[model samples]
Target: MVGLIWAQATSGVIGRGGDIPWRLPEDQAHFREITMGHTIVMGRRTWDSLPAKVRPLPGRRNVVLSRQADFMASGAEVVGSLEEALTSPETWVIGGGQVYALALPYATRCEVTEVDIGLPREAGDALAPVLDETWRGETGEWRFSRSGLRYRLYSYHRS
Candidate 1:
């Protein structure tokens, strides 16, 4: 199964200048729960943005996409293309805009957390993948108070 997981603001912002714009502990936990034990494919920037201590993301097989032939990600497999990463039995494409856009077409499911507030565009906000008519939104479950941020978990399946 090929899946994608991400948290985005009302303005469709998933990231800003190599980092997420918001700090939602609940959403972070939610992400960890959903992606645990799954092989996660990410772009070089996403891998780089991770904390140095957990660069490869413990408990999941980390596959990083990098065009540079000499790129070496310690503790993770490096692939040059999305197709190469998709070879894993169960994979989750886990972000940086370009990776999400490239993997979306092949994704079977998507798990998203939608934050209620929008951030300034000048923050260099990275856009989320466009979920068009080809995708169907399932029922959303609301989560509030945990991080003091209003957000909802939504599931989408490619139709």
Candidate 2:
């Protein structure tokens, strides 16, 4: 289960003001269902983007990658190496754009959820990393969220 996972808008917009631009509870559930009981890895900004209550994302070991050698994450282990975070089978790189780009080349699999928002790339502060040709994958049937947003899931593996 070592891979990358993310939820992004069709325009590749992922976040604004350090948080997701939309609220899709079904997407949240989907993310939780997949990552639960597994180790989750994220960058420092991604760590701070989490809500206070879910900062450490209960039920999983959380690893935070930080540039500062002395950085402190209240309930997560601070790391500077991607290799260290990817050691366990179930480790998933959950992200911010920079972290995604950093881990992309090393990923063997990836799971993506596309939201319906159509904002242009310039509108969001962070964008999803452009997945390249090294992987082959298919998307699932389109689904709607309770909030009336349309979304779909994509699963990819190294080609």
Candidate 3:
């Protein structure tokens, strides 16, 4: 299964200045649970933006997309393109921006956490992938995280 996973604000803002603007442990837990035994593909910047301890994302195979010929991410495989990442057989394309955009066409599913906070779209450098008509959407009830953030889960399947 090829899926894309991410969290975004109401404005579809996923990141600001190369880092995600908010932290929600509940959302993190959801992410970990879903991708625990799966392979995750991300761009170099997403790997770069990860926290030091979880840089490679524990328990999951990490494949990073990089243009740098000599780039190596510790505990992760570095691939040159989305095509190479998909060769993993099962993948979750985690992102920073361009990587999500690149993987949209090839992905079969998307698991998203929608945050209730309103961040200005212009304030963020990264945006979430647009879920178009070709995708079928399913959503769950809204809930509050321990961090006091309102959030909900959404799953999109390519039809």
Candidate 4:
């Protein structure tokens, strides 16, 4: 099964300047809980944006997609395309906009956390492609309020 996981602002912004624009510990924990032990495929930028201390997230096999033939990321398997990354029995396409866009068509499921705030566009915000009519909600949205922010977790299956 190929799954995609990401958190985004209500405006659909997922990143700014190679980093997440907001912090929510609960969302972080939720991400960990869902993706732990899974093979995670991410773009080079997403892998680079990770904290230095957790370059290759522990307890998961890290697969990085990079177009550069000579690119090398410590503790990760570098592949040139999404097709190469999908070789695993089960894989999660973890983000950066380009990666999500490339993996969306092949994804069987998606786990998203939608934050209740709109972010400014000039911050170099990256977007997840619109879900529109191709996906259906797989579970009831779970609302969460933490750190003065409101958000909801949604699980969706491709139609």
> What is the clash count for each candidate, in the order shown?
0, 0, 0, 0
lDDT-sorted candidate list, best first: 3, 1, 2, 4
Q: What lDDT score goes with residue 133 in model 2?
A: 83
Clashing pairs in 4: none
- Superposed by TM-score, candidate 3 places the C-alpha of residue 122 at a distance from the truth, in angstroms, of 1.2
- Evaluated with lDDT, which candidate comes out highest? 3
Q: Any residue pairs clashing in model 2, and if so which?
A: none
TM-score against truth, every candidate: 0.92, 0.92, 0.92, 0.90
lDDT of 4 by residue, 26-107 (tens): 8889899888998999999888878878889989999999999888788888999789998888898888688888988898
Writing each residue's lDDT as its tens digit, candidate 1 over 6-116 gives 888888888776677778988878888888898999999888888889888889999999999899799999999888999878888889788998998899899998998
Model 1 steric clash pairs: none
lDDT-best of 2 and 3: 3
Clashes of 3: 0
Error of 2 at 30 (Å): 0.7
Runs in model 4 with CA error above 4 Å?
A: 120-123, 138-142
Clashing pairs in 3: none
Off by over 4 Å in 3: none
Worst 10 residues of 1 by lDDT: 139-148
lDDT minimum window of 10 residues, candidate 3: 118-127
Model 1 spans with C-alpha error above 4 angstroms: 120-123
Whole-model lDDT, candidate 1? 0.85
Q: After superposition, how far is residue 103 of candidate 2 from its true place, in Å?
A: 0.5
